[PDB]
Amino acid sequence: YQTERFTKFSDTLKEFKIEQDPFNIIREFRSAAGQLALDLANSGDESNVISSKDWELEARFWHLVELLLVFRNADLDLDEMELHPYNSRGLFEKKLMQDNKQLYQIWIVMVWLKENTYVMERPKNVPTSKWLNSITSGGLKSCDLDFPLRENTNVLDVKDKEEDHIFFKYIYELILAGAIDEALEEAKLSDNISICMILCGIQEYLNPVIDTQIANEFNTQQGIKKHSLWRRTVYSLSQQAGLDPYERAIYSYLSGAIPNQEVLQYSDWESDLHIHLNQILQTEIENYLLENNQVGTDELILPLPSHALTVQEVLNRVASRHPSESEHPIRVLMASVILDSLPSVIHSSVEMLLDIIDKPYLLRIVTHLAICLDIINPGSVEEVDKSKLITTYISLLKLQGLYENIPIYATFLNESDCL
Amino acid sequence: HNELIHDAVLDYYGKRLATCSSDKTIKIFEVEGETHKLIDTLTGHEGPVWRVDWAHPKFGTILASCSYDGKVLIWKEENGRWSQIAVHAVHSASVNSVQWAPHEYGPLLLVASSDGKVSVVEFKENGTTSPIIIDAHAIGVNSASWAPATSRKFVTGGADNLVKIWKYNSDAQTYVLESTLEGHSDWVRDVAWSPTVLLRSYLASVSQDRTCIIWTQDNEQGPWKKTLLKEEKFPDVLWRASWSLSGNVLALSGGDNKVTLWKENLEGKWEPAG
Amino acid sequence: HHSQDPFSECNDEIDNAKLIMKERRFTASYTFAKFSTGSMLLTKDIVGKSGVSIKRLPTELQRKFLFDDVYLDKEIEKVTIEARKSNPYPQISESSLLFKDALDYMEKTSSDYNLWKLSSILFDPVSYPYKTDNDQVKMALLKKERHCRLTSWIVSQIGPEIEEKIRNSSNEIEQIFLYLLLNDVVRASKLAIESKNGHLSVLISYLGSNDPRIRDLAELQLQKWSTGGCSIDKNISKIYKLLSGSPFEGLFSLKELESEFSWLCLLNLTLCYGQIDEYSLESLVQSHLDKFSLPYDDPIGVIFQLYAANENTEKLYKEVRQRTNALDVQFCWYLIQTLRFNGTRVFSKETSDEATFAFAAQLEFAQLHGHSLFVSCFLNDDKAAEDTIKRLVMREITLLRASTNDHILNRLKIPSQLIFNAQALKDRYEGNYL
């Protein structure tokens, strides 16, 4: 009964032009393709596995689209923030994020990227306590994390190192997914209190009393003051070999640096794109703070790259790093939306109709997207291209035998009089 | 020569010193740093001059001295030259102390002789004397100091080891004895009231039995409080006991070659300073 | 046979003398002495030229700049005298004296400078030039400022002590701790980085950020440890104890370090990590004080207690008084005075006067009548103020009339009457009237 599908998409469309906000089409558009990615997925031929992921990807695509347009468009210039030099680093970061839409968008995208990141299942059968084997084999003159650092790693029992691996990898997938709280929880409960503390440094300092504009969100100061230091400290720590690749990967992420080869080697387009945008951010914020004399010199312990790529260049590099995935039809739409050059690509793929017709979803998506675009942003796509698209799509509603609802789609043109 | 001067005194502005010894002469000097130029010598006593003492400059330049000849001789510098202006010795023995009163009482004086008497010789309009004496101590009187006030009073150190506090009274015209205190085992050498118009009233009475009792009276009511300075005898009998103006400090001229200095602390008890 | 001689005159006096003594009790060990008008003493001195000594009563007052008239002039420019409301005698209305002031007149090396300095850091009001959106925020910023000054000063003092200890440490992690003792997080962090103690290094960066999350986490790690933790480095635990926020106030306590460092060195720890945000500089310092007793005779110690005792400063002041003399007569007066004229604290009309008298006197004894007059004004008791001023004005009108620094003096607010009045009596005693 699947061949219904075109039903759901056009189905929404009706309920819209039938209630006379626009952001719900996309919202549902998402939900729809999501529901589909489930069917084709659940049980079926191993040929569906392929057409399945292409639906999930579709889903993600609408999500990202909703997120970004809501912010870009929904935008109704709220009030400005006036800080003073006595305000905390924390307030400055907040301000930077309110004032710089360009950058905030990067955040929006990262939130999206995390939202769709895969995380393993919580490791089962975890040990009552940390480095038990080493302690039991007697050899740990000290139980602090810096012990095997202080002298040859021969100290830790293999079985232990084996478990730190499971832990660190899990915490890492968790951080990549945005699960900072699950991350802290795991650290706590799994007896990694020290590693836990490191995770707390993630926050910049805020003090309700002085940084008044947030005395709403907090009642007690929190976050750490010597952040630049923290950052270098972490960064330096990330570079010290002798640590698990995943532990080093964690500090890399936290420093706003790029994880080591062993770990980075397994990241894909999203993963990889995620990592690098994180870096643009990290860098951007620190400079904003340097630009405002909110970083004390003592803390500039080590050198951290001060030049930020641009989303454009990040995508570009991430691209050539994953050609296959970069090139996929809808992933190219994701990037277009990110860079905003969306109509730019609608009109583009439209002329690819004058090997787009090989891939099913594409012709549909571009259309509904274009529809949505002009609803939300009257003027978006060229009236020419709407036609060109609806046309070629309407003709496929025929080949499908569902002239039943071609009317909904006709609602845009005076060229409808030709149907 | 001057092997033994019994008393010396400073004028309100401390520019003119008046020392009196045993040779019966009272030597007046013009003090200045290390140079106290001798300007006078005054002979007119039939015994060693025990004490000299100027009066408030509010009365010219008057100096009432008491000598061994049972006579008290008032003097006075007149146009550059001294002149015994009057005399008062209605006492049958050697006169010991002579201390004027606070200038708000007029020009009163206070003499204490061995005949257990102490007078208050005022000077009338003609400059003449009007004595109103009173018997103070049976076996003789060794001293008597005045009391600054704002109901007048003075202390008297005796030979029967007492320390009396007399108070003027209109109904009696002659100072009425109000309080007497006991605590010494030998002739109460010197007694002194303090010029401290603070919370309470202090009085350090030195004696022969080598003790120094401090009579601190809360106020116009609660009787005095005995407090032997230190609870050990000084290596030799004590003579003088003078209070300081600014500081309520106490100096003790013990007959042992140096003057100790005792100050009161928050314990109410006294401690050495110097 | 007993003979008869007519030159028995040199033997008549000798026996007529010994007769006088004994009937008087006048023992050959005679000494006389009474206090001068100009408070000083004269005692039988058989080596002068009069038989008396013009004794310059030793001064309890020992502080150089006080014998300078420059100081006193500048110090009067800071006062605002108003005539009493129960008599025409002066008595300070406004004072702008601050411990800060007297610093120019002392050696930046003398322990005295240290007393005045720290007393300023803790009491003199601090000023904040940049305007705050809100006034409760100003308060907050003023506290960081003062806390920042106090903490930076303590580090000056412990400096050498600790540097010495760093010189000898033969263990890396121990030095990392020692640097924290000097409040230098960054250098500790760096050393940690350099000594392969990487994890520790990150945690160190937290030191100064009262982050409660980190605070409880650190205590937790410490607990899990002292409940088995077969072995944890003696210094790594000290550093965690510091992250816990209550380094003595706890169960792995650094109190035993009481015998290795200056009481001041340890107070720094509490003041630097101790839980800065949740407390006031006062109650925090009190917090530390309640854990360790200080040397009764230590002055910079006495100040901290007076500072911390906020609620009953006086009570303690009196207590301090009857226990040590670290606080001199001058200081105690100056102190009570600033705190009074600045709202900083409160003192009894009586304790404030008692302190004034004591100084007004120590000053008169030094012959500094001008200066001793000035002080006299701060008296609350009008009656006493009057008497005290008067009495001294006359008894000394002479010296109080030479220089303009002597002029501004009687110009304080000495009554027109009292000035010429005493002046009159300086004439009927000198013999040149009107």
Side-chain angles (χ1 to χ4, degrees):
Chain A
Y1 89 80
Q2 203 183 102
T3 312
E4 206 72 47
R5 85 198 48 181
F6 311 65
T7 296
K8 322 210 179 192
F9 296 58
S10 78
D11 220 300
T12 330
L13 294 166
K14 307 190 185 187
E15 312 180 303
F16 177 68
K17 193 223 60 172
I18 301 302
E19 190 184 307
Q20 32 50 234
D21 229 47
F23 291 130
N24 285 279
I25 307 177
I26 336 185
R27 204 153 317 158
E28 279 202 298
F29 268 169
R30 183 193 177 185
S31 193
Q35 183 66 70
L36 300 176
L38 292 166
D39 304 350
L40 277 157
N42 244 323
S43 42
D45 229 56
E46 291 180 51
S47 55
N48 293 132
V49 186
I50 302 295
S51 63
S52 170
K53 312 163 192 168
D54 290 298
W55 272 108
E56 309 177 313
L57 261 166
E58 248 237 56
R60 295 175 181 176
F61 172 76
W62 295 115
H63 191 203
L64 197 181
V65 180
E66 157 192 37
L67 292 173
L68 276 179
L69 286 170
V70 171
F71 173 69
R72 295 176 189 173
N73 239 112
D75 203 289
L76 285 181
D77 312 317
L78 299 179
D79 244 308
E80 176 91 69
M81 202 154 105
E82 307 174 302
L83 300 186
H84 303 289
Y86 68 75
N87 276 135
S88 305
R89 275 234 207 174
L91 261 189
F92 281 82
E93 185 181 45
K94 297 259 183 174
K95 160 133 184 170
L96 171 64
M97 298 312 266
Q98 291 196 329
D99 297 358
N100 177 350
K101 304 181 188 180
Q102 262 282 49
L103 193 169
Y104 192 75
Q105 238 155 112
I106 297 192
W107 179 235
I108 283 298
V109 174
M110 289 180 58
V111 170
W112 170 69
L113 276 173
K114 298 170 190 155
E115 183 107 46
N116 318 305
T117 287
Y118 174 77
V119 179
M120 64 200 264
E121 56 176 41
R122 217 180 306 84
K124 305 177 178 172
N125 265 293
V126 171
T128 39
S129 56
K130 172 118 185 176
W131 293 351
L132 205 41
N133 306 291
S134 302
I135 299 286
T136 291
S137 295
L140 286 182
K141 301 251 182 181
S142 183
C143 308
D144 71 292
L145 297 195
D146 284 339
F147 186 70
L149 296 195
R150 231 174 301 134
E151 50 203 282
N152 75 71
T153 312
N154 191 61
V155 175
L156 284 196
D157 173 293
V158 177
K159 296 193 168 194
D160 280 319
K161 295 186 174 185
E162 302 192 306
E163 281 153 330
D164 278 21
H165 185 67
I166 319 313
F167 173 71
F168 286 120
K169 175 164 174 183
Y170 179 37
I171 291 296
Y172 179 68
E173 314 208 333
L174 277 185
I175 301 186
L176 278 186
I180 305 301
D181 293 306
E182 288 74 357
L184 297 170
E185 184 173 60
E186 252 290 315
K188 285 197 218 70
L189 303 185
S190 68
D191 199 14
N192 280 289
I193 289 73
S194 292
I195 281 290
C196 182
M197 291 188 268
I198 300 248
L199 292 176
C200 291
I202 284 167
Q203 289 110 66
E204 209 84 52
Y205 187 71
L206 273 165
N207 184 331
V209 174
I210 297 185
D211 311 308
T212 253
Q213 25 278 95
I214 55 80
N216 211 299
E217 299 173 52
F218 314 84
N219 31 56
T220 300
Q221 81 286 335
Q222 188 192 50
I224 91 79
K225 308 181 194 186
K226 295 213 169 68
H227 214 263
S228 292
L229 179 51
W230 178 73
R231 200 186 174 202
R232 272 90 191 156
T233 309
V234 179
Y235 178 55
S236 160
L237 177 55
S238 88
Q239 288 296 293
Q240 290 171 46
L243 288 195
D244 190 293
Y246 277 107
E247 166 157 33
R248 298 206 304 286
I250 293 188
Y251 304 146
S252 282
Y253 192 74
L254 296 196
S255 300
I258 294 178
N260 63 94
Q261 230 313 78
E262 231 180 316
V263 176
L264 183 63
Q265 122 192 58
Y266 299 137
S267 48
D268 56 289
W269 200 76
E270 295 71 63
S271 232
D272 198 302
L273 166 58
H274 181 179
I275 300 285
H276 295 77
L277 287 175
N278 184 42
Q279 167 160 71
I280 310 238
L281 210 58
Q282 203 82 322
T283 306
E284 276 316 328
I285 290 70
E286 193 146 79
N287 289 311
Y288 180 68
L289 298 178
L290 276 162
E291 283 179 52
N292 285 267
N293 299 296
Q294 287 291 318
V295 173
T297 187
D298 297 302
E299 292 176 55
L300 304 180
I301 283 329
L302 303 150
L304 274 185
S306 53
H307 173 73
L309 293 195
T310 66
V311 185
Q312 176 70 76
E313 262 287 315
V314 176
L315 279 166
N316 276 350
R317 306 191 182 170
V318 183
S320 66
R321 197 168 312 133
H322 303 269
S324 39
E325 312 170 59
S326 306
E327 289 160 45
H328 171 305
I330 116 286
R331 245 187 275 280
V332 191
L333 289 175
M334 302 181 137
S336 294
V337 171
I338 278 186
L339 294 174
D340 209 314
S341 67
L342 202 43
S344 315
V345 188
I346 294 280
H347 197 307
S348 172
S349 52
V350 129
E351 288 179 52
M352 253 241 119
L353 299 172
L354 196 65
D355 290 305
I356 146 181
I357 325 178
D358 295 311
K359 294 187 172 179
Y361 50 74
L362 183 46
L363 185 48
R364 180 225 293 85
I365 305 177
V366 191
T367 311
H368 302 82
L369 175 61
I371 304 288
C372 252
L373 271 159
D374 271 303
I375 293 176
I376 310 170
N377 248 331
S380 284
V381 220
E382 201 177 309
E383 293 186 299
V384 183
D385 297 302
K386 314 173 192 169
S387 315
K388 290 202 173 194
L389 282 172
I390 319 176
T391 288
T392 320
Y393 182 46
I394 290 181
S395 78
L396 285 186
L397 290 172
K398 291 176 175 174
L399 220 204
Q400 271 304 297
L402 285 183
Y403 319 75
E404 304 191 312
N405 300 320
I406 305 228
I408 295 54
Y409 298 65
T411 306
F412 305 85
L413 312 173
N414 199 54
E415 299 286 290
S416 173
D417 296 298
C418 306
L419 295 147
Chain B
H1 204 80
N2 227 195
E3 300 300 0
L4 190 70
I5 294 149
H6 249 292
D7 198 14
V9 173
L10 298 180
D11 45 311
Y12 200 76
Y13 297 48
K15 228 178 192 309
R16 228 173 285 170
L17 169 58
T19 50
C20 68
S21 56
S22 301
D23 29 63
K24 312 170 186 177
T25 66
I26 292 134
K27 302 174 176 299
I28 272 62
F29 301 62
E30 271 308 312
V31 189
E32 278 183 4
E34 293 274 305
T35 47
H36 5 19
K37 175 188 175 178
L38 189 62
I39 267 208
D40 274 299
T41 296
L42 311 183
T43 297
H45 274 302
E46 300 173 294
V49 193
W50 290 162
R51 299 196 182 185
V52 280
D53 180 48
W54 314 65
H56 190 80
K58 175 184 181 181
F59 314 119
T61 299
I62 299 174
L63 152 50
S65 81
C66 61
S67 186
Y68 177 54
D69 67 307
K71 301 174 186 174
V72 179
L73 270 159
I74 283 58
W75 305 62
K76 171 159 186 171
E77 190 169 64
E78 208 73 307
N79 317 308
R81 295 170 184 173
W82 286 77
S83 49
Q84 296 176 39
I85 277 186
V87 72
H88 179 261
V90 303
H91 297 309
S92 50
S94 180
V95 179
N96 298 291
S97 75
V98 59
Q99 196 185 68
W100 301 88
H103 64 294
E104 297 78 358
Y105 296 173
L108 305 191
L109 188 65
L110 199 68
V111 176
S113 185
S114 304
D115 55 301
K117 285 190 173 185
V118 175
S119 49
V120 184
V121 170
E122 176 180 64
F123 291 52
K124 304 195 174 189
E125 332 205 326
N126 308 345
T128 56
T129 63
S130 174
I132 282 72
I133 305 76
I134 50 172
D135 295 312
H137 291 117
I139 314 184
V141 187
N142 287 180
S143 184
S145 285
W146 273 94
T150 304
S151 56
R152 305 175 175 182
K153 293 174 187 177
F154 60 66
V155 51
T156 46
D160 57 308
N161 307 356
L162 281 179
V163 187
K164 298 185 177 186
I165 293 303
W166 305 67
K167 181 177 181 178
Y168 174 56
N169 227 296
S170 289
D171 302 55
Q173 287 290 62
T174 192
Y175 290 73
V176 180
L177 182 54
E178 187 178 12
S179 293
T180 301
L181 306 171
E182 285 179 48
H184 293 298
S185 49
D186 200 309
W187 292 52
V188 184
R189 269 305 172 187
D190 204 355
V191 291
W193 199 304
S194 188
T196 172
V197 194
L198 187 261
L199 296 176
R200 68 194 66 167
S201 297
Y202 309 72
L203 303 185
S205 58
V206 149
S207 186
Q208 195 87 229
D209 62 309
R210 292 166 277 70
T211 40
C212 177
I213 301 181
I214 298 169
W215 309 95
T216 77
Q217 183 176 52
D218 327 308
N219 57 321
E220 306 186 301
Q221 295 182 353
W224 314 82
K225 296 186 173 185
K226 210 172 189 176
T227 307
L228 302 172
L229 198 65
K230 65 175 173 186
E231 302 189 313
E232 289 147 17
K233 303 178 163 189
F234 302 76
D236 200 57
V237 178
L238 304 176
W239 306 125
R240 291 286 166 57
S242 188
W243 291 114
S244 84
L245 292 168
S246 189
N248 198 61
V249 178
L250 180 66
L252 292 184
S253 304
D256 26 299
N257 274 55
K258 161 75 179 183
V259 195
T260 54
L261 289 162
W262 308 66
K263 52 189 180 189
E264 180 182 55
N265 50 60
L266 302 80
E267 263 288 304
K269 307 168 187 180
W270 310 71
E271 189 172 354
Chain C
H1 301 274
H2 196 273
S3 73
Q4 193 67 16
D5 74 320
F7 309 132
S8 186
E9 277 178 56
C10 318
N11 305 314
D12 276 334
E13 305 147 47
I14 298 184
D15 302 324
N16 177 40
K18 292 168 186 171
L19 183 72
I20 305 177
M21 291 183 109
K22 192 178 171 187
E23 75 173 54
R24 221 84 212 55
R25 304 296 249 82
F26 264 162
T27 290
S29 62
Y30 195 61
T31 300
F32 68 82
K34 275 182 180 176
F35 269 114
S36 166
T37 303
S39 285
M40 65 194 122
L41 236 308
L42 291 174
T43 298
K44 173 209 180 180
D45 181 49
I46 70 170
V47 175
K49 184 270 171 66
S50 173
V52 298
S53 56
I54 301 78
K55 295 300 179 179
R56 190 93 299 174
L57 176 40
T59 3
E60 295 173 274
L61 193 85
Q62 315 181 344
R63 191 163 265 150
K64 308 174 186 180
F65 71 75
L66 263 187
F67 296 148
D68 202 294
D69 308 297
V70 169
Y71 179 82
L72 177 64
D73 219 306
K74 290 184 177 180
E75 197 180 72
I76 312 207
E77 299 192 68
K78 308 263 194 166
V79 213
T80 280
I81 351 288
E82 158 199 307
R84 265 329 83 182
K85 297 173 185 174
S86 53
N87 86 60
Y89 277 94
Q91 263 149 115
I92 299 81
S93 166
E94 294 290 294
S95 168
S96 70
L97 277 318
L98 319 164
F99 300 78
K100 182 195 294 175
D101 299 333
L103 293 181
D104 297 304
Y105 308 101
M106 330 186 90
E107 271 216 312
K108 290 197 173 186
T109 258
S110 51
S111 69
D112 203 21
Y113 185 60
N114 284 338
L115 208 197
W116 290 73
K117 180 61 155 177
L118 167 66
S119 296
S120 178
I121 287 183
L122 301 179
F123 294 107
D124 287 334
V126 182
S127 46
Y128 201 65
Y130 319 136
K131 293 203 170 183
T132 321
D133 293 310
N134 169 329
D135 197 290
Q136 316 182 325
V137 173
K138 189 185 187 176
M139 283 305 115
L141 295 179
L142 293 168
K143 171 184 167 190
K144 286 324 179 61
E145 192 60 293
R146 196 189 292 296
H147 172 282
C148 186
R149 305 290 179 55
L150 170 58
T151 192
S152 304
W153 178 87
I154 295 182
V155 185
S156 299
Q157 317 296 297
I158 66 172
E161 163 173 30
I162 294 299
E163 256 143 357
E164 228 315 271
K165 283 180 155 288
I166 293 182
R167 220 188 301 305
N168 324 330
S169 60
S170 299
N171 169 292
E172 298 263 58
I173 309 73
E174 188 200 19
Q175 316 183 24
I176 290 183
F177 176 84
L178 286 170
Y179 282 105
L180 294 178
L181 266 182
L182 281 177
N183 198 26
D184 191 320
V185 178
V186 177
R187 229 189 303 165
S189 228
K190 282 180 194 166
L191 177 47
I193 283 302
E194 299 178 302
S195 44
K196 189 60 185 173
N197 288 295
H199 295 97
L200 208 179
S201 182
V202 184
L203 304 186
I204 297 277
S205 63
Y206 297 150
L207 295 178
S209 297
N210 207 201
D211 195 291
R213 300 180 281 146
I214 286 296
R215 235 163 55 206
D216 301 331
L217 251 346
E219 184 72 330
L220 183 56
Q221 184 61 91
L222 230 17
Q223 278 161 1
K224 306 195 102 306
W225 277 337
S226 64
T227 313
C230 86
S231 293
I232 213 307
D233 184 287
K234 291 175 180 176
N235 286 304
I236 276 163
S237 73
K238 285 183 197 165
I239 305 182
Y240 270 84
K241 194 55 185 186
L242 285 187
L243 289 165
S244 81
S246 317
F248 312 102
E249 353 185 315
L251 71 126
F252 226 123
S253 198
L254 292 180
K255 189 170 202 306
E256 68 181 307
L257 298 203
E258 175 173 34
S259 61
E260 307 294 307
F261 308 85
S262 169
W263 63 267
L264 188 69
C265 172
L266 296 208
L267 162 64
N268 196 30
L269 289 182
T270 301
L271 289 187
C272 290
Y273 311 134
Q275 198 157 300
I276 296 175
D277 298 301
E278 292 86 332
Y279 286 86
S280 50
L281 241 307
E282 293 91 328
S283 46
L284 187 70
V285 173
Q286 191 48 288
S287 163
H288 184 76
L289 261 23
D290 296 309
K291 272 86 186 172
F292 319 78
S293 300
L294 298 179
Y296 248 124
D297 303 288
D298 190 324
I300 43 274
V302 176
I303 274 63
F304 273 124
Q305 322 196 31
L306 280 176
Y307 172 61
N310 167 296
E311 303 166 301
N312 356 301
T313 305
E314 170 176 296
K315 171 169 160 287
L316 175 50
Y317 173 52
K318 280 181 179 166
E319 257 160 274
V320 188
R321 232 58 253 294
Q322 318 171 305
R323 287 179 165 183
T324 305
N325 287 295
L327 290 196
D328 62 64
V329 212
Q330 180 183 6
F331 190 84
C332 295
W333 172 69
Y334 201 152
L335 184 166
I336 296 184
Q337 254 28 248
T338 307
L339 299 217
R340 210 184 65 167
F341 285 82
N342 274 125
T344 312
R345 243 64 148 182
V346 296
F347 281 90
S348 310
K349 284 285 196 176
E350 32 279 75
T351 309
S352 180
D353 278 347
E354 184 182 67
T356 309
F357 278 124
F359 190 36
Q362 302 306 314
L363 280 170
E364 195 175 290
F365 284 178
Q367 297 304 73
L368 314 167
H369 301 292
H371 207 307
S372 145
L373 182 53
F374 172 17
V375 175
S376 301
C377 318
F378 298 77
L379 267 58
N380 287 120
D381 185 12
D382 309 301
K383 211 72 178 178
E386 173 165 354
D387 168 45
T388 310
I389 299 280
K390 162 189 301 175
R391 205 183 49 56
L392 161 60
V393 184
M394 313 202 264
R395 187 193 69 186
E396 291 300 316
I397 20 168
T398 307
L399 292 61
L400 302 176
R401 308 256 289 190
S403 320
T404 283
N405 82 297
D406 286 286
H407 208 192
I408 305 171
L409 286 185
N410 303 275
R411 286 166 159 178
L412 252 53
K413 289 297 179 176
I414 311 299
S416 296
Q417 191 76 243
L418 180 74
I419 317 173
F420 89 71
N421 232 27
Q423 186 54 295
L425 185 84
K426 176 61 170 187
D427 311 312
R428 174 162 46 180
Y429 140 90
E430 293 241 318
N432 26 306
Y433 214 66
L434 297 205

